[PDB]
Amino acid sequence: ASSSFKAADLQLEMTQKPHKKPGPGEPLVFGKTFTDHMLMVEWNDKGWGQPRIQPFQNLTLHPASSSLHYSLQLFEGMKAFKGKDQQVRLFRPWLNMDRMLRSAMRLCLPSFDKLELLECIRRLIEVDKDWVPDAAGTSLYVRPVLIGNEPSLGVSQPRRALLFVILCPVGAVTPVSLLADPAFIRAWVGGVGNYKLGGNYGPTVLVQQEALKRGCEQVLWLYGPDHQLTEVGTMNIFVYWTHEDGVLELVTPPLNGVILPGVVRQSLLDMAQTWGEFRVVERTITMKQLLRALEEGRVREVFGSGTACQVAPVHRILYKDRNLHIPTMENGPELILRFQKELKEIQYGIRAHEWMFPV
Amino acid sequence: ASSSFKAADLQLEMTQKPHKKPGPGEPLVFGKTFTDHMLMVEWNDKGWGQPRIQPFQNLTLHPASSSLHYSLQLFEGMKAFKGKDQQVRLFRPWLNMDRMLRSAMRLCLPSFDKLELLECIRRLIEVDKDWVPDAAGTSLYVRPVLIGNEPSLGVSQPRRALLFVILCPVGVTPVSLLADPAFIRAWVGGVGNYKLGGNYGPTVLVQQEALKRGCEQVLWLYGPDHQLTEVGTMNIFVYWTHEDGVLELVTPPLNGVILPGVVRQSLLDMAQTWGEFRVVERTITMKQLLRALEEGRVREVFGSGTACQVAPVHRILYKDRNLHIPTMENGPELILRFQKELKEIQYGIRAHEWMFPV
Ligand SMILES: *Cc1c(COP(=O)(O)O)cnc(C)c1O
Ligand SMILES: *Cc1c(COP(=O)(O)O)cnc(C)c1O
């Protein structure tokens, strides 16, 4: 069933025609430019096949592939950074490997050895090393994907699967406005919003378009009768404020089933707790608490965290037909800038850290 | 172009390699046998391309296709029946087209003319007409799909899409259900009321959990009061004598967690035209079912859907207790009546406006 593929059995097929690299100064739009190679591993009832780094090419899928009919698909997202010394380093990839496996088990997709996938990805990034940019605010986005590939129309356990990894060079704090409407629910307790599955994203496109029509940039996902702040778009939410007791704290919603356990989220919690300058807690945040904190002048900063945008400040929330100004930007944004500075130092290798995996 | 593809612009490529084809062939397993041809239509920001009936072949997709990363995918399911006179007819396909368009709009996928897609599908079934079986209880399952095919990694409205249709020749038996409140299929404010791929993938593990606990399918419960919503991928109906003493047929309302089934609607239409009992759409709770079973007021409980048509329920495993549902010892009179009437309409024994000739 699952004996896993090995990096030692990795086959390499180099490209005959290397693609046109963007070049210095050229704008790198998110997920539009792809590298020369990709990783590919196939699975069936007998087990996993040999992993291979092959040229970037199209996938050949049967029209009845369960990935297209029943969303037997999941993905991951992590970044690789290149420092001044030309050394490429991956940001906490072990955590993405842990999350990917959990997503695989939830969709009855094959298990794999996390360290073997990590080594195969390390080798893929090494082959396409020249594609990783070295300018400030730039990186390489790594996109691992595991899909069901059963050539049948029954809603069941796939007897075939495909694991592939693609790479994208991405370029270079901008404040965002949010729509907070209780009618749109992203995830439910006992659901699958805590897993990075394709199914959680497609239905959010219309909600984002609805945010744009009301003058907002992103969506503030509310949950329950008390209107709990859960996520901001595809990012985890943090609030830096003076709490009701009078203590300065950094709060983010707890992992109770409706929150995707973000790697950047975990990193910000680790970093803030190591400093020991304020209280760091995982607690439910309601719109009433936020509103009362805003009118009492207790809110300092509100922001989103995730791989793509890193740390994204919030300046406005549209809730119950009222525009609420969030004092982020006016408060520095001190905490955001400190988090960004320390993350940039770790990521680009200015400061050595166990969080970075060298390629 | 401009708004929709036209069936008048239909291109036809016949197969140079026709495959297998069953006897009969004895076990006609659902979705494992495919026909010789498929319909394919592409879309981009400039409009729809020319529709094409081509041989059954693999799809060629870019690794960054939005259908594989963000589940910008939807599907439909309807059946084509071959009668005595060898005439093939589709069951209320207009309703499936209406639902497919609603699903498309929910995922910001391109709009299309419903009657033009129906005509393109009619032409596809005509090309593969010999694949439709004529035996009792058999049919041709039609599977339309619309996917996002944007070669980018941003979660946004696709600038490219693909619409394809594949066909499957397919062939009263009671079922057992697992009723555990821990499993949630859909939520109010969600997308369980649309036939999107995303609603099915997470159910695979739950179905495996039903099988290892001794049941054949899942009874989907919702809320603190344990509302019976769906039976697997079928709508649920309860035929009973209500607390007020009135004989009624009830099915959960379209409040966001129920998929508006074509068979569901057809059973509601038929039962309403008979006028022999009350026919309503209302929430059904496990407490109400238990109370009715104890008082001997339940006659029949069943699921409705395209694949299994009408499926009787005999057992529900709830709170680690096996609850016997008396469906089979009450005939099942209503199920058999629905099945008889559906068969007469489907196989062309009686002419009806619900059937679309191919
Ligand atoms: C990807 C994602 C995040 C952030 O996770 P990171 O691992 O930090 O990139 C947060 N919320 C949702 C809904 C996400 O999809
Ligand atoms: C397809 C489906 C139904 C039934 O719809 P029909 O149009 O009658 O085939 C019911 N519930 C779910 C969840 C479904 O996917």
Curated annotation (Swiss-Prot), chain A:
CDD domains given in the database record: BCAT_beta_family
The enzyme's E.C. designation: 2.6.1.42
Main location: mitochondrion
Biological function: Catalyzes the first reaction in the catabolism of the essential branched chain amino acids leucine, isoleucine, and valine. May also function as a transporter of branched chain alpha-keto acids.
Subcellular location: Mitochondrion
Phenotype for residue 231 to K: In HVLI; reduced catalytic activity
Gene Ontology biological process: branched-chain amino acid biosynthetic process; cellular response to leukemia inhibitory factor; isoleucine catabolic process; L-leucine biosynthetic process; L-valine biosynthetic process; lipid metabolic process; regulation of hormone levels
Residues that, per the record, bind substrate: 141
Protein name, as recorded: Branched-chain-amino-acid aminotransferase, mitochondrial
Listed cofactors: pyridoxal 5'-phosphate
Entry-annotated residues carrying N6-(pyridoxal phosphate)lysine: 196
Chemical reaction(s) catalysed: L-leucine + 2-oxoglutarate = 4-methyl-2-oxopentanoate + L-glutamate; L-isoleucine + 2-oxoglutarate = (S)-3-methyl-2-oxopentanoate + L-glutamate; L-valine + 2-oxoglutarate = 3-methyl-2-oxobutanoate + L-glutamate
Impact reported for residue 143 to Q: In HVLI; reduced catalytic activity
